[PDB]
Design a protein around this ligand. Structure first.
Ligand SMILES: CCCCCCCC/C=C/CCCCCCCC(=O)OC[C@H](COP(=O)(O)OCCN)OC(=O)CCCCCCC/C=C/CCCCCCCC
Ligand SMILES: CCCCCCCC/C=C\CCCCCCCC(=O)OC[C@H](COP(=O)(O)OCCN)OC(=O)CCCCCCC/C=C/CCCCCCCC
Lengths: 227, 224
């Protein structure tokens, strides 16, 4: 329907959203076991961009009880939005990698390389919950997930999506994603190198999707405490 | 910074937003006393459009006391926003004009006024309480009473106190009004001048409407 341009600049003098995502993602990367073909991984830059999602409000409800339960461990006024979120924005992750060539010997050579994750496609149901007053945000499931056939609510806790008993049968929240790599002109001929680059691209793809899934995808969520 | 596209389609599937605003404004018009030269005023159509404001969050605070008090007459929350609008809002208003042709003749001229191209750049506040929400435009961004550096959320500062209503600039910076006349008529000058008068009147009326519905100390209130 209506378009908006939002600017949260003053809310970010000391901490910048981009930088927060970058350090978090970096932490995640440096805590992952790396294959033999890559020596180091590092986020060179993260950029949420200037193009955001198309947001459709689907329903308005009480927050899920699982949130309350979470708080119990470690109010009518509270509220929860169910949102259809469609993203084809300009998010861009630039990652630096040291590709390791082992073709002769072990660790024969290292090529500085850098990869670009971009063009992320998404179309999924999320929820945003206000509770007392920590803020919860979580991507529930893709719009066309089979567990929605028959047109009965996602907010059913005994239903498949929310119960999260079969993560394997869920269709991926990230619909598409583009990865490029640029390497030295000198290496564009060698097939061994190109194959290694391919493997690294795939690995990075899976790693990024994993990160997203355990940071934002239900039953995981983003918790903001404001005291 | 970042762009969004918002769609509130299903929250109101009985009643529509544009329709609600249309009969609200219609009520306003029908309880306005009209000049002698116009017999009927009516909102033909209202359209908030698809182009919204550029929004900058300035501050975040607990809601004003006037709201809490407004409840009877947490953690509840209030946003202070810089709002810059150059959107595609469009009001189309129908009017029956009264024309004086010579030989002391009276005639009626149906006319269609279009209010569009509204320019705005102003500090507004959006307060969520219990949970009813409050929408109110405080003042224009370049109001003198904001001179140098001072806060707008100061309750006995000028803007919030509502001390001196005529001293402040109007929230609406710009506005465009056109008129559709079937020209059997547009050629005469009598008709064009009558239409001019009507346009000015409508300008005043609309500005007045928004300052009594949207401008602090008045606000828009939602009930759920
Ligand atoms: C959803 C807002 C997005 C678009 C906002 C555009 C901003 C620029 C628009 C220029 C001025 C705003 C145009 C609106 C004219 C006034 C309309 C109006 O008064 O409608 C009120 C009338 C009241 O009806 P009742 O059911 O009787 O409720 C109690 C009545 N007191 O109709 C309504 O209730 C609908 C209210 C919808 C208001 C929509 C306009 C609000 C302005 C948007 C705020 C701008 C930025 C803030 C973001 C808004 C986030 C909620
Ligand atoms: C404003 C969102 C616009 C962009 C949305 C398009 C979706 C793009 C696809 C994914 C983009 C988001 C990737 C970054 C997510 C991971 C970053 C991260 O974890 O940093 C959070 C880090 C703190 O994390 P913890 O509180 O410790 O939680 C630990 C894990 N449970 O810093 C923060 O404060 C997180 C900030 C959260 C903002 C995330 C926004 C992305 C979510 C998009 C939802 C779209 C709906 C819009 C509603 C937003 C209302 C604020």
């Amino acid at each position: 329907g209506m378009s908006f341009d939002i600017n949260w600049s003053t809310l970010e003098s000391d901490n910048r959203l981009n930088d927060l995502i970058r350090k978090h993602l970096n932490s995640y990367l440096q805590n992952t076991q790396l294959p033999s073909y890559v020596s180091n991984l590092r986020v060179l830059d993260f950029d949420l961009g200037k193009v955001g999602p198309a947001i459709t409000l689907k329903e308005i409800t009480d927050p899920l009880d699982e949130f309350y339960d979470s708080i119990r461990e470690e109010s009518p006024n509270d509220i929860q939005f169910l949102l259809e979120v469609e993203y084809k924005g300009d998010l861009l992750v630039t990652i630096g990698a040291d590709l390791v060539l082992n073709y002769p010997v072990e660790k024969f050579m290292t090529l500085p390389v850098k990869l670009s994750i971009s063009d992320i496609g998404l179309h999924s149901l999320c929820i945003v919950a206000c509770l007392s007053k920590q803020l919860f945000l979580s991507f529930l499931c893709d719009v066309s997930d089979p567990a929605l056939d028959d047109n009965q609510t996602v907010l059913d806790p005994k239903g498949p999506i929310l119960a999260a008993t079969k993560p394997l049968e869920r269709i991926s929240i990230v619909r598409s994603m583009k990865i490029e790599t640029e390497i030295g002109e000198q290496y564009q001929g060698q097939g061994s190198v190109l194959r290694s680059v391919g493997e690294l691209e795939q690995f990075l793809f899976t790693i990024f999707k994993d990160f997203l899934r355990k940071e934002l995808a239900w039953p995981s969520w983003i918790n903001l405490d404001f005291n």
